[PDB]
Amino acid sequence: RLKKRIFAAVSEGCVEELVELLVELQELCRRRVPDFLMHKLTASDTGKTCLMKALLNINPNTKEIVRILLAFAEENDILGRFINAEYTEEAYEGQTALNIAIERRQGDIAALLIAAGADVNAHAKGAFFNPKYQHEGFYFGETPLALAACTNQPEIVQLLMEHEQTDITSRDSRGNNILHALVTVAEDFKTQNDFVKRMYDMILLRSGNWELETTRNNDGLTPLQLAAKMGKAEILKYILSREIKEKRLRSLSRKFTDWAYGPVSSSLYDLTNVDTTTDNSVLEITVYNTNIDNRHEMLTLEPLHTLLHMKWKKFAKHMFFLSFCFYFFYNITLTLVSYYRPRGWLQLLGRMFVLIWAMCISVKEGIAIFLLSDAWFHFVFFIQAVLVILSVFLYLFAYKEYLACLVLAMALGWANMLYYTRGFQSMGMYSVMIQKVILHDVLKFLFVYIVFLLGFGVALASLIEKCPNKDCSSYGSFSDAVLELFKLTIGLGDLNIQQNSKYPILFLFLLITYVILTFVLLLNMLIALMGETVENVSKESERIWRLQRARTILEFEKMLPEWLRSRFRMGELCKVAEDDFRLCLRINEVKWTEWKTHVSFLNEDPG
Amino acid sequence: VSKESERIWRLQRARTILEFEKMLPEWLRSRFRMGELCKVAEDDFRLCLRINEVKWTEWKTHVSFLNEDPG
Amino acid sequence: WAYGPVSSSLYDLTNVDTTTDNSVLEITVYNTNIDNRHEMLTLEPLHTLLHMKWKKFAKHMFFLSFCFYFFYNITL
């Protein structure tokens, strides 16, 4: 009944005199050696001592209870194993008094424990701090530094870094260091007020070198590629264009102004890990990522935009339109060889051309298809090529049923040219909105309409008597009924009433109701809906088209052999510091509002 | 209309849910019983429904809570 | 439960959960004389109560009734 009394007196905070008397009694009992104090001061079931039970429930009189407690612990020479005590439950392992004094936003007590000999590298390698599914657990970095930096306490970050025994480059269980943590936690502006970018900048500057932005966690990613894999588009915009104006820490930046004269200036970006020349750059990671849905804002940043534009107008234009010409001639050869079928020096060339190009397209699509909306045109290309090659196989055999496969393949190619219509911005937006429309509405409308068509078809075909003058009625079998309904929908047929029925007024009522239901209702309703969609799609058409063109550019860049890729090599070297020599990509600019005396630049005389 | 379509649809689905909940017999309804007890005060024991949340703007020292160690 | 920016509020359901004569959920839903039910079925415990009831049994019962109706109509 002593441990419980101590716990109650320190948690309730109703008085410090009670805990004073209880500690006096405890010392008197101890006067009759430190392990006794330990086992009588902590809870064995959950490892938690009195300091944690004191800091968890802070009352306006806790700064005295902490002082008295650690003073008593020092007067018996146990302060070490006491202030450094850690949980033992398999759920919050490793937690200490410092994590609790920081999570409760207490600064004074935080410094009080830091100065007394607390461990500043306490790894909270628990199951509540390294969770599996969110909303049950908080992952912050598992170090008091990262916990003081993720809950927006700059004062404690300064006090922790100004220390000596602390370790800034420590890596936790998942592999992350403090910068991977700040990248995994950064959310947005509308929901975070942009405090993580500032802590990133401060922590980076307080240790000036590339030691923190080069290490890899257990997936082999740096804070840059880690900000690109996840959708973090604000920290990426910060890191890609980070200009530092100080003198000694200028080699830490990624954009150096080097030419400025008046309002005109020529910034010189950096491309050391952004230009698809390594294992997984930031460009390839940004483009091929299909799990973020925020690629609207990540392919418009500073060097990525111009990198894509330069790659495009350097070789992707040529390769794209060359491939389009090849496809067009392949399809015209197909169409002519089919139309002029049999019901030579040049003809054999056409047939071998069709064969080899179908084989090539099928091979390429089978290769590219194993690696997965976004890429169904691969499926369409594959089906068309397979149809052509199967038809020619069956033709070289003793078969005449090849015409079906041939004409189906032909029609599929002519309807397939809409994929090569994405090379033109206007036409690209056009094709994208066509596909958006067929996804949005025509599918629902077709489902409903087929339901109605088949229902009323079987109804009308049942109402008809079987007359033995076969030209007596037109709604005969089920097929004829559904066909007459289709024609009367697209407005070609003829609506007559003397249909050999037995209840002709009922026949007329059903037909008029079908005509109403579709023609007046569904078509006009769908037209209004697709009026609603277009007003909302035209603003993202350019974005989705730009992302598709980026996919195409990076797909083409892989077909080239080694020496050509070494030959293009966007961007040229630029000595940046004492000895840096980083590749770069110059981007000129003009700004008429921010007038300033130019101090930082690489070259005095502008060129 | 597109701005109130979701509202009217949600209200219709609510009507349907509550319509279905009355067809079940007694013991099944006693078996589902959304939400679990939670001792709230000296002796309160009110049924409850937990709803987790995340807020990055209003920073404050936490004083009021039922269970000290988070689970 | 609050720890950092994450926290776990624990609402109350003593007269909001269709277990009495006329609760607040049933009164809110079956009321046909207000025309303000746009904003009353999106409040704190009502929204999640409806969502949990739905994904607990109304999904099953709804799809089962639809299947019964579809087979009845095809037989017809």
3-state secondary structure A145-214: HHHHHHCCCHHHHHHHHCCCCCCCCCCCCCCCCHHHHHHHHCCCCCCCCCCHHHHHHHHHHCCCCCCCCC
* Interchain pair A56, B70: CB under 8 A: no
Strands of the C6-12 sheet, one edge to the other: B36-38, B46-54, C6-12
Q: Is A233 exposed, middle or buried (0-12, 13-18, 19+ CB in 10 A)?
A: buried
H or E element, residue A335? helix A317-339
β partners of residue A572: A584
Distance from the Cα of A103 to chain C's closest Cα (Å) equals 6
How wide is the angle at C-alpha A55 spanned by C-alphas A141 and B53, nearest 5°? 55
H or E element, residue B57? none
Residue A219 half-sphere exposure, CB side, CA atoms within 13 Å?
10
Look at residue A98 and give its three-state secondary structure: helix
What residues in A contact B2, CB-CB < 8 Å? 532
Query: How many of the other CB atoms lie within 10 Å of CB of A476?
Result: 16
What is the total residue count of chain B?
71
Question: Which chains share 3+ C-beta pairs under 8 angstroms with A?
Answer: B, C
Measured distance CA(A239)–CA(A306) in Å, rounded: 17
Distance from the Cα of C72 to chain B's closest Cα (Å) equals 20
3-state secondary structure A65-124: HHHHHHHHHHHCCCHHHHHCCCCCCCCCCCCCHHHHHHHCCCCHHHHHHHHCCCCCCCCC
Q: Which two tokens stand for residue B62?
A: 């936490």
What residues in C contact B11, CB-CB < 8 Å? 29, 37-38, 41
The minimal CB distance from B59 to the residues A58, A105, A191 is found for A105
Cβ atoms of A601 and A257 within 8 Å: the answer is: yes
What residues in A contact C6, CB-CB < 8 Å? 135, 137-138
* Interchain pair B56, A91: CB under 8 A: no
End-to-end CA distance of chain B: 44
Q: Is A102 exposed, middle or buried (0-12, 13-18, 19+ CB in 10 A)?
A: buried
Q: List the single residue in C with minimal CA-CA distance to B62.
A: C2
What residues in B contact A187, CB-CB < 8 Å? 56
What residues in B contact C51, CB-CB < 8 Å? none
Q: Which two tokens stand for residue A89?
A: 């439950």
Strands of the A582-590 sheet, one edge to the other: A255-257, A264-270, A582-590, A572-574
β partners of residue B51: C9
* Interchain pair A136, B62: CB under 8 A: no
Q: Give every CB contact of residue C29 below 8 A, 6+ residues apart in sequence.
A: B11, B14, B15, B18, C37, C41
CB interface of A with B, residues 497-556, below 8 Å:
532
Q: List the single residue in B with minimal CA-CA distance to C18.
A: B18
Experimental method for this entry?
Answer: cryo-EM
* Interchain pair B54, A135: CB under 8 A: yes
Q: List the single residue in C with minimal CA-CA distance to A136.
A: C6
CB interface of C with A, residues 6-65, below 8 Å:
6
Size of interface A-B (CB pairs under 8 A): 32
What residues in A contact B68, CB-CB < 8 Å? 53, 56-57
* Interchain pair C3, A150: CB under 8 A: no
Measured distance CA(A40)–CA(A34) in Å, rounded: 10
Cβ atoms of A440 and A533 within 8 Å: the answer is: yes
What residues in C contact B15, CB-CB < 8 Å? 29-30
What residues in A contact C3, CB-CB < 8 Å? 103, 138
Q: List the single residue in C with minimal CA-CA distance to B23.
A: C61
Q: String of b and e for C27-36 (b: at least 16 CB within 10 Å)? A: ebbeeeeeee
Long-range contacts of A219-223 (CB under 8 A, 24+ apart): A219/A175, A220/A279, A221/A180, A222/A273, A223/A179, A223/A180, A223/A182, A223/A183
What residues in A contact B54, CB-CB < 8 Å? 135
Q: Which two tokens stand for residue A582?
A: 């980083």
Cβ atoms of A53 and A7 within 8 Å: the answer is: yes
The minimal CB distance from B54 to the residues C6, C37, C44 is found for C6
Measured distance CA(A143)–CA(A125) in Å, rounded: 9
* Interchain pair A151, C3: CB under 8 A: no
Q: List the single residue in C with minimal CA-CA distance to A459.
A: C76
β partners of residue A29: none
Residue whose token pair is 């409806």: C50
* Interchain pair A104, B54: CB under 8 A: no
Measured distance CA(C48)–CA(C44) in Å, rounded: 7
DSSP character at residue A8? H
Tell how many helices (H) and how many strands (E) occur in chain A.
26, 4
What residues in B contact A56, CB-CB < 8 Å? 68-69
CB interface of A with C, residues 478-507, below 8 Å:
none
Cβ atoms of A441 and A529 within 8 Å: the answer is: yes
Q: Give every CB contact of residue C64 below 8 A, 6+ residues apart in sequence.
A: none
Distance from the Cα of C5 to chain B's closest Cα (Å) equals 5
